[PDB]
Point group: none
Chain length 24, copies 10
């Protein structure tokens, strides 16, 4: 029934992430 163009992406060319410490 459904007629969809369904095109999705992500932009990440250089993630660089230093979370550290978490407590929950």
């Amino acid at each position: 029934n459904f007629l969809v163009h369904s095109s999705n992406n992500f932009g990440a060319i250089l993630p660089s992430t230093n979370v550290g410490s978490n407590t929950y």
Copy 2:
């Protein structure tokens, strides 16, 4: 029934994030 252009992205060329510490 539905006719959609459904194009979504993210912008992130250089994330650099230092969360630290969390308590919840």
Copy 3:
């Protein structure tokens, strides 16, 4: 039934965020 241009993005070229500490 629905005819939508549905284009969404984010702007983040250099996030750099140091949360610290939270209590909830």
Copy 4:
């Protein structure tokens, strides 16, 4: 520490390119 989380509902009828990044607990950067 500890946690107590319950009964989370994210219902949406229709979002025409509506940005609702309704993120619960966690550390992401994409």
Copy 5:
């Protein structure tokens, strides 16, 4: 510490490019 969270509803009828980043607890940067 601790937490007690319940009964969260994000209902939307129609959002024509409405920005509702209704984010609950967590650390994100995108």
Copy 6:
């Protein structure tokens, strides 16, 4: 510390590019 949060409703009929970033508890920067 602690928390007690309940019964949160974000209902919108129609938003023509209305900016309602109705964010509950959490640390974001986008």
Copy 7:
């Protein structure tokens, strides 16, 4: 430390390119 997490619902009726990266606990970058 410890954790207590329950009753998480992410229901969506219809999302026309709606961005809802509703991520629970964890460390991702994509």
Copy 8:
């Protein structure tokens, strides 16, 4: 440390290119 996680539901009716990377605990980069 320890963990206690239960009752996680990710139900979606229809997502027209909706991005819901609802990732629970773990370390991924893709």
Copy 9:
């Protein structure tokens, strides 16, 4: 039924934010 141009973005070229401490 609905015919919308639905283009939305964010402006953030250099966030740098040091929350500190919160109690709720």
Copy 10:
């Protein structure tokens, strides 16, 4: 019944991420 173009990808040319330590 359903007629969909269903094309999805990820953008990651150089992830480099140093998580550190987590407690849950």
